[PDB]
Amino acid sequence: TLVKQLSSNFGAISSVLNDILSRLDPPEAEVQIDRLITGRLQSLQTYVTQQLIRAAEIRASANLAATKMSECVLGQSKRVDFCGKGYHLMSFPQSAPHGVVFLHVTYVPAQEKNFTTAPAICHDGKAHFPREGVFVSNGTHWFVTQRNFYEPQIITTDNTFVSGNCDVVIGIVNNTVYDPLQPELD
Amino acid sequence: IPTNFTISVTTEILPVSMTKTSVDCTMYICGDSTECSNLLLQYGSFCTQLNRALTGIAVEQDKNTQEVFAQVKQIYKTPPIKDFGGFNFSQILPDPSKPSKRSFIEDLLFNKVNGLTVLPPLLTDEMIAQYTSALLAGTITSGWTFGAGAALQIPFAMQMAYRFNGIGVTQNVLYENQKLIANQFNSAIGKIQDSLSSALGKLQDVVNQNAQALNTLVKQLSSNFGAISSVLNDILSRLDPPEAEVQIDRLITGRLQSLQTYVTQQLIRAAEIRASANLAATKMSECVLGQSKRVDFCGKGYHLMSFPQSAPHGVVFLHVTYVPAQEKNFTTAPAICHDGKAHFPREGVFVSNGTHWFVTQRNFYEPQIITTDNTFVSGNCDVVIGIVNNTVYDPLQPELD
Amino acid sequence: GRDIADTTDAVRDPQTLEILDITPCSFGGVSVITPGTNTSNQVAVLYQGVNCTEVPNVFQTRAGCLIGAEHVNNSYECDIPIGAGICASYQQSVIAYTMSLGAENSVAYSNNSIA
Ligand SMILES: *[C@@H]1O[C@H](CO)[C@@H](O[C@@H]2O[C@H](CO)[C@@H](O)[C@H](O)[C@H]2NC(C)=O)[C@H](O)[C@H]1NC(C)=O
Ligand SMILES: *[C@@H]1O[C@H](CO)[C@@H](O[C@@H]2O[C@H](CO)[C@@H](O)[C@H](O)[C@H]2NC(C)=O)[C@H](O)[C@H]1NC(C)=O
Ligand SMILES: *[C@@H]1O[C@H](CO)[C@@H](O[C@@H]2O[C@H](CO)[C@@H](O)[C@H](O)[C@H]2NC(C)=O)[C@H](O)[C@H]1NC(C)=O
Ligand SMILES: *[C@@H]1O[C@H](CO)[C@@H](O)[C@H](O)[C@H]1NC(C)=O
Ligand SMILES: *[C@@H]1O[C@H](CO)[C@@H](O)[C@H](O)[C@H]1NC(C)=O
Ligand SMILES: *[C@@H]1O[C@H](CO)[C@@H](O)[C@H](O)[C@H]1NC(C)=O
Ligand SMILES: *[C@@H]1O[C@H](CO)[C@@H](O)[C@H](O)[C@H]1NC(C)=O
Ligand SMILES: *[C@@H]1O[C@H](CO)[C@@H](O)[C@H](O)[C@H]1NC(C)=O
Ligand SMILES: *[C@@H]1O[C@H](CO)[C@@H](O)[C@H](O)[C@H]1NC(C)=O
Ligand SMILES: *[C@@H]1O[C@H](CO)[C@@H](O)[C@H](O)[C@H]1NC(C)=O
Ligand SMILES: *[C@@H]1O[C@H](CO)[C@@H](O)[C@H](O)[C@H]1NC(C)=O
Ligand SMILES: *[C@@H]1O[C@H](CO)[C@@H](O)[C@H](O)[C@H]1NC(C)=O
Ligand SMILES: *[C@@H]1O[C@H](CO)[C@@H](O)[C@H](O)[C@H]1NC(C)=O
Ligand SMILES: *[C@@H]1O[C@H](CO)[C@@H](O)[C@H](O)[C@H]1NC(C)=O
Q1: Does A170 contact chain B (CB < 8 Å)?
Q2: Window A:23-42, CB contacts with C under 8 Å
Q3: Does residue B274 contact residue B17 with C-beta atoms inside 8 Å?
Q4: Which residues neighbour B96 within 8 Å (Cβ) at sequence distance 6 or greater?
Q5: To pair with A139 at 20 to 30 A between CA atoms, which of A94, B43, B145, C94?
Q6: Environment class of B370 (CB within 10 Å of its CB; exposed 0-12, middle 13-18, buried 19+)
Q7: Backbone torsion region of residue B228, taken as left when φ is above 0, otherwise alpha when ψ lies between -120 and 50, otherwise beta
Q8: Residue of B19, B63, B71, B75 best to disrupt the C interface, most CBs of C under 10 A
Q9: CA A76, B136, B198 angle in degrees (round to 5)?
């Protein structure tokens, strides 16, 4: 567009300086030269302004790309939906013409299942809470498993901690907690 | 050490998009005259260039809205039974009685705020309300699991226990204070409801700026710019073409300058609107679909969860945070010296009430007896600066004896 | 007479002395909705902001008058955006519909169950 704007009159009699010079005397010629100069100056200024406005957006995109290089490639990020979709594991950069490509590796769970759950287990007038995980039941028995993957385990005093009585907690369920020290003692 | 807590709910308002306007370059400068159009055809591609800039600005607003509000794969519905453990979500959940499914707070928010053409948005207000309702129902029913894949159900109290764990407080603190926490949340939501009906200035500023720019553009059509008159029909009726051209040229120059100034300032405004929309999309991803550890990003305090509500040309976030209260003085030590060896706390701090020594968690006062189960040994008592003398209990010995 | 922008909104007739309001004639843009050139050579035309009567299947939207597309009362995912919740697709002729936000799902929430 900038190059093509060089064939416009902008009100003058011609778009060629040499034709204006040949077909007119100097005092009248300068009047047309001024019109051409004004038009071409306006075209240049428009080009420069739009170039600045575009460079600002390019800078913002480059800043985002630099932050992503710092936080997805040189570390593991906990920011949600910043480094791919899912639970971020690691990223690999690639170089593209005037750009960069990030390959994000994430962890997606699958194949979920129904379970029954309780907040605490009441045993011997004491309330037990899971140290790290959740209480689940398959219908007849109770286990404790980690939250993001199903691996049931027997409820003992090594998976739980005691805090208070059974009267306060809403939804406490009766069950048994196995003490590993007693069988070895006896 | 704090001995009590407070539940705080606060609001944040972010503009997302603005009005989509278009101007025909030829109609503004000339109107319906052929002579002016023929004279204007000698200036190049200014009119084509100005129309394309405005078209790009208009197209960007739909992307702005889509990036913020379309973040759920499916439209989740809340269950008919509202058994959420004592927590009450009614001013933020939709009501079918209103013809639009906007919630109460959304209704309060919506009640407050020549070649010219205004274009309608691609998404209507009902669709945006449906997006917000789907996000909020997903958050209530499945926690943060629907952000990273399929929605997995969980009771709300257990989700709040997970969120208390996420800020360094144990689960029994939540489970032994559930009614008080529910009451505090309900009171805070009610306070927001009262404060809104009795704010949204950032959304009105954009409307005022756009309207004022359009008014200036329209009013600049009554300037002579050196011609005998500002009305083109009078010039064409009173003068012959050779004498009319010298005035029409001045009118064309002035009107071109006016349109170019308007378009440039419109582009500069659109850039800022885009930056604000990007920030809003980041907040939607990180505060509503997860729990953020960044300080002062989602509210003021320790972030628990956030709820989005749609506003006219904007979005409102309600941030729920944890604020400790009612602190108390204690005396502390780095380690304990017992049997010539130094003990350190596993996940707590040693405190003293003046006569006895206990171990407690850092964000809540809950003293306990110092045993070998909650401490670990490293070295001897000579190296540490500030170690104190005390006894450490061994649970196995009394049971064995 | 003059408006806020100082234009001749109203005039008085000289011969009979009556006041006649002056309102501009209709104008607007013209947009063409097309599939690929390989796919077909038929198009739909949208007159933006123009009532359908003023135009010299006809379907009226909030964006304007749509000519050449039949309205179907089903909902699909958006293909070509028209505006105000209306999209267009080629399914053979061009059809216009109301876009759907997505599939509807109800989570099996309970105070006892976990997944
Ligand atoms: C819940 O899990 C428990 C533990 O695996 C199941 O109990 C076992 O069931 C198998 C199946 O016949 C028996 O061979 C084992 O002897 C059982 N173990 C014990 C300790 O009794 C139980 O059947 C599961 N419940 C359901 C409904 O599937
Ligand atoms: C922690 O703070 C809460 C809220 O201030 C206290 O609960 C209130 O306590 C007062 C004083 O007994 C009662 O009159 C109120 O009815 C309680 N509830 C509310 C909603 O105000 C709570 O007692 C504090 N905890 C401790 C240990 O003092
Ligand atoms: C500091 O904590 C100790 C331990 O709880 C307090 O000592 C107890 O005081 C109560 C009466 O106030 C007695 O019934 C307990 O038997 C005491 N416990 C022991 C182990 O002796 C003590 O009062 C607290 N305050 C101060 C100032 O020492
Ligand atoms: C959990 O049980 C509900 C009961 O209707 C069922 O619809 C849902 O699919 C189950 N979740 C699974 C199988 O992951
Ligand atoms: C679930 O709700 C039922 C019905 O109100 C109630 O009987 C039961 O105790 C509740 N369980 C929990 C864990 O809240
Ligand atoms: C648990 O056991 C206690 C006594 O052992 C009893 O009072 C209580 O009702 C039991 N809980 C349930 C849910 O049956
Ligand atoms: C929630 O609060 C409203 C008052 O704002 C009340 O009318 C409603 O009954 C409450 N919800 C429940 C389940 O009681
Ligand atoms: C703690 O000690 C400081 C300094 O003596 C005193 O100002 C303050 O009132 C005391 N109590 C609390 C709760 O900070
Ligand atoms: C704290 O500083 C005082 C000096 O005022 C000193 O006597 C004391 O030993 C210091 N505390 C410890 C644990 O060293
Ligand atoms: C702590 O006990 C040891 C061993 O009895 C003793 O040598 C040391 O002086 C005691 N510390 C203080 C501050 O008295
Ligand atoms: C002439 O104009 C006057 C207005 O001054 C009007 O009252 C009258 O009817 C007109 N006569 C004719 C014949 O048009
Ligand atoms: C037009 O569509 C056909 C689909 O059958 C495709 O094969 C063809 O490549 C398309 N045209 C061009 C130029 O790609
Ligand atoms: C078109 O004109 C009819 C007749 O007055 C009117 O009912 C209709 O509302 C108009 N169209 C629009 C979009 O307003
Ligand atoms: C539009 O809805 C009406 C409802 O009566 C129905 O009869 C009509 O078939 C629908 N349109 C199409 C194209 O099916």
Answers
A1: yes
A2: none
A3: no
A4: none
A5: B145
A6: buried
A7: alpha
A8: B75
A9: 115
